[PDB]
Design a protein around this ligand. Sequence first.
Ligand SMILES: [Cl-]
Ligand SMILES: [Cl-]
Ligand SMILES: [Cl-]
Ligand code: NA
Ligand code: NA
Lengths: 277, 277, 276
Amino acid sequence: AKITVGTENQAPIEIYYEDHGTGKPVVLIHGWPLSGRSWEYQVPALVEAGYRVITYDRRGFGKSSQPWEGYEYDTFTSDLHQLLEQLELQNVTLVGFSMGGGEVARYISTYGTDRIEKVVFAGAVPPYLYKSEDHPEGALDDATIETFKSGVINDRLAFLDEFTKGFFAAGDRTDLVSESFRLYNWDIAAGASPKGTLDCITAFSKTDFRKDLEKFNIPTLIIHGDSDATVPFEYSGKLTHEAIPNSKVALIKGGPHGLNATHAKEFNEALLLFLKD
Amino acid sequence: AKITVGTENQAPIEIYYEDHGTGKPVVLIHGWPLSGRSWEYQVPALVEAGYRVITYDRRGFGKSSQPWEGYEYDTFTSDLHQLLEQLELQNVTLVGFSMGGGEVARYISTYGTDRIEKVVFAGAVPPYLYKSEDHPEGALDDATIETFKSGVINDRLAFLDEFTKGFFAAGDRTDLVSESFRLYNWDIAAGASPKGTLDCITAFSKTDFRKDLEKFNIPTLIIHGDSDATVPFEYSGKLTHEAIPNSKVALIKGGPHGLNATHAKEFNEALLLFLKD
Amino acid sequence: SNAMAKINQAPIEIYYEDHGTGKPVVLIHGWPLSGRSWEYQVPALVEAGYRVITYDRRGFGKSSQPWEGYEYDTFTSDLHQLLEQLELQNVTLVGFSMGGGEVARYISTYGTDRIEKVVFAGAVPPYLYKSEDHPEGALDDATIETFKSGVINDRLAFLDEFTKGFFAAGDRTDLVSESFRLYNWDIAAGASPKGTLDCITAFSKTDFRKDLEKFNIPTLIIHGDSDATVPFEYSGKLTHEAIPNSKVALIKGGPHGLNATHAKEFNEALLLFLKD
Ligand SMILES: [Cl-]
Ligand SMILES: [Cl-]
Ligand SMILES: [Cl-]
Ligand code: NA
Ligand code: NA
């Protein structure tokens, strides 16, 4: 229940995954800096609705290897390719949460749709989060990005504590998950690679997926919160929907970034409607 | 230190175990939703007394694989059998704590007594924990059972926080462990399979071991607290003792469910006096 | 990346991580933590052009948790197997707290052919035990027994308290966040209870004074002036005095865990010594 996806200095880089149930495959791709365990509220709904659910832990996160390099989307996407190939998956639905939307974007662009029936962008970073002189439309400027980087560099554990509180907060509303659930998530992020945790920030904030979204001509759903403080709908999900013909949008009212946990009922109803269609 | 005990969706199921010391083998089987680490206070006393001590993590728990299926006693007992077979254990004592009493009961019933010297039911779920009009001497009625399942389904992490508090409390006394120790146990439970955690509730509450206990013709010890909130003596150990006429009881005054930790000396004394010839 | 080094029936494996390319710097963590304790050193070392290897001592972090071998003969044998398996050359061994014991015993037992330099950081040599005959130690019998009975009786609570002192410099108890402290508590909580206990005797009562007589290579002592567990005066000071040509970096306000609280100074001292 590890996939070997490469080597670094001749040591295998191994990806931890879980593969549950019977049915068409739904591959769930977690956000930063969490793991496959962040999909707790989705897995049973999906299996009960007749799908086979695969989660995996991105390199550097969860129970996967912690290499020094490879923390960019070409490699992240190759890692996903090895998983789909090794499990011999067909008619797959790719569900990318937050930075996992990047693997989705790039997978279609690089490897095409032979194996892929449908895709879902859930609170996801495309089309391109960076705000700059060349891309004045985006959400995250250098200054904002540097704060994340400097937090991870100077006190990652305290920064993660703060980040996880905000991840499940919608505006003023900070009671959408229990303190135990928050701490649980903090601890999943605590164990991650410090290097991978840092490099991911650059990857998810500054990778431009616009060219990739062009190759999308399969059914596509955007699930997103209207109160997402990390990846604002107007700068991400809304534009991914507008980039992709025939895509559907489920804007969840009062949904924060971690809306798959906070608004599980609504998230799953939108996801399940989309899959059975 | 893993044993492969099966396969599901093309991937092995592995059980983590530890094997310490030299002498007669004593296999310690943990309760829900913890791991082999719950035996911290027993292992050293057993090793020092000249026993070889094997702990393992039940499928779905601790460091073992987290599959989707197999969370019922036929499989759990099959996993135990493979552990005994693979480690070639002879002249074994099985010690089952809480739901681990179920593997004890079912092993003897299914595989016989040829490998087995003695057995111990510690705060253990047999004979049959379900409580109903027709089976009034169970411990857990439908409503209670549904409160467990609901808690795990809707906020497992908060539910576990509360469960761990009651686990070590003897009536109104809740200072029997430190907060650090309780939180340690919380974290062990947090990392378990959500599905395994849920299905176990049905396994331990609705499995009838009465027929299995009929086959116990080997020396049997019941160790149980008189203040066990989760598995009360009167509706479990007391009845196991009555079901197995040879059996000895060590009823520990002020003992909560987690009495192997709160009353380690009294627990260990009962175990050592029984283990000896 | 990470890998396992093979070192009843099941092999003992040591978990290690190997990052970057260049001359190797092998970081040996203190009790009862793991390789993850080096968080603040790894990046600066690789950025400076070194390869950084960390490993988890048997019983700790992600390594096997056997019943025996929790003494410096075996701990140093484990280190030797790792360096042999990786075929390392020109190594700088960095031993934090009890990890200075592996450094001392490695040079004494296996010699220096694979080793260019050594660093004793907040380290337990020359001999941490404090007694009548050996007043120059740090830890007396009453203190040692407090550690043992704490670990036997409520290891989790003992660790919570230990981790508070680890990062405190006298009255400065704000040097790390609660989050960081609790992260370190959890790393310790998952270690072997048996290894955790036996290490106390290994780090407190092993005498490395004859080992330090074999040191004829460049040597840096990095130590805090406010280390409650391993006071400079009874450790790093004496290790420096034992070793000719050895350098000292005494960090002002540094507690035991100064590699985290004072990363900037710890790292400056280390890099200056590595390139010389
Ligand atoms: Cl993300
Ligand atoms: Cl149980
Ligand atoms: Cl130490
Ligand atoms: Na953990
Ligand atoms: Na027998």
